[PDB]
Amino acid sequence: RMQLSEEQAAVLRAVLKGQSIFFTGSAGTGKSYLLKRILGSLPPTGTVATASTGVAACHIGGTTLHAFAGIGSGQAPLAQCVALAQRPGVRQGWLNCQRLVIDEISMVEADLFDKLEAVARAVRQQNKPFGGIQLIICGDFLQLPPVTKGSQPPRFCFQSKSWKRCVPVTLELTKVWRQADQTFISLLQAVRLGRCSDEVTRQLQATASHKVGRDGIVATRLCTHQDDVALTNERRLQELPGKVHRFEAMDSNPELASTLDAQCPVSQLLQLKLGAQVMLVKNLSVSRGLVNGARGVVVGFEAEGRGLPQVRFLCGVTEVIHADRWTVQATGGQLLSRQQLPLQLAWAMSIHKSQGMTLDCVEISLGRVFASGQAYVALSRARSLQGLRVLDFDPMAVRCDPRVLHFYATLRRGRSL
Ligand SMILES: Nc1ncnc2c1ncn2[C@@H]1O[C@H](COP(=O)(O)OP(=O)(O)NP(=O)(O)O)[C@@H](O)[C@H]1O
Ligand SMILES: CC(=O)Nc1ccc(-c2csc(N)n2)cc1
Ligand SMILES: CC(=O)Nc1ccc(-c2csc(N)n2)cc1
Ligand SMILES: [Mg+2]
């Protein structure tokens, strides 16, 4: 285990003292890593690991907050949500939960937080904030903004009238680890706060000339919408001359495939060719650089058996990629599994799917208005400036929601620095 910073240790201390806490910090400050250390330090009984999204839940071995709550979409009236939470399996999960971990809190809208808080009280019959559950919450409100299952403009989670009562303590992680380069760290920090000076703008524009690929590997284009990702990956695959090689997943419940898809980074049908640009979506070997996010290209298929792909990675290593398995925790503690190769096509990927990840071979076009925090998320995935190529950069792409700046300014009002 790595040596926790003083900041990271302080959060761990609070959690083990039984304090409900929100902890926050820039991209790559080790929030999710610290969640893993927290989960290891707690009894597994009574501790529930969630995140706002399926992609983020994977990073910590958890489930989605949606799946844990078991209140359907959460759009139904509170009384109907309570009844849903009273269902077998669901109910027990609420009753037995003493500590609830939530990563990537920035995607949870205030109305949903309010709903969960009320459900917690109703189901557990405990007249205390959040049913008396110890909340352990982290993320960055200057990253991806709240989504909604409804049609109204969402409020940030901190706008809930229950936020401060439910998470009375706030701590910060301030040392970025993802990037090693101070120039790049300082550049990302300016973007995160919406402060694009002439110098910042010039620096990002200069990346347009970066050749980020090496030896037949090309940059993954980060896109705002999955439609555009799917179309790009399919068209680039189709244009390759080789025969198609197919790898069909085996699911424990094929019928529930769609529930699996939301919490699992691999598809039912994987199609590959010589030359296919692929991303490894599971940590295989940290030492050999075979980690989640690693980019490579298919350099052959084995002659024998299933004809598994041989993949040359940007790092250097060339390796035959074997089947792996994901076991997802759905509603009411139901478990579903998928066996598949841990590969996705990677000429393109959505910014939402990169949430929480480190990447190192990325291109993005930043000349349009984006959602608050979305340009920052995209840029802050890259380990290094030289693995990033930004096209058509314009500060219009970089927006911070004023509500979030006000939140952060209020949060630090009494602090030393
Ligand atoms: N104490 C530490 N010492 C050294 N490296 C660390 C430490 N804590 C975390 N890291 C590394 O920091 C990197 C980023 O960690 P991660 O947990 O993804 O950050 P994050 O704050 O969750 N990122 P994001 O989800 O993008 O906001 C990982 O490669 C960790 O190994
Ligand atoms: C839970 C979940 O859906 N995870 C996930 C993560 C990454 C990707 C991915 C990588 S490259 C690409 N085109 N898409 C897809 C899915
Ligand atoms: C609760 C807390 O710690 N701070 C906080 C910050 C901002 C807002 C907000 C933005 S505009 C609006 N109507 N509400 C609410 C609360
Ligand atoms: Mg994270």
Residue numbers in the entry: 204 to 620
Sentences from the study reporting this entry:
PIF1 is a conserved helicase and G4 DNA binding and unwinding enzyme, with roles in genome stability. PIF1 is a conserved 5′—3′ superfamily-1 (SF1B) RecD-like helicase found in most eukaryotes, prokaryotes and archaea. The ∼45 kDa hPIF1 HD (residues 206–620) has two well defined RecA domains (1A and 2A) containing the conserved helicase motifs required for ATP binding and hydrolysis. The 112 amino acids of domain 2B (residues 437–548) are contained in and covalently linked to domain 2A and contain the ‘rail β-hairpin’ implicated in DNA unwinding, that moves relative to a small ‘wedge’ (1B) region in domain 1A during nucleotide hydrolysis.
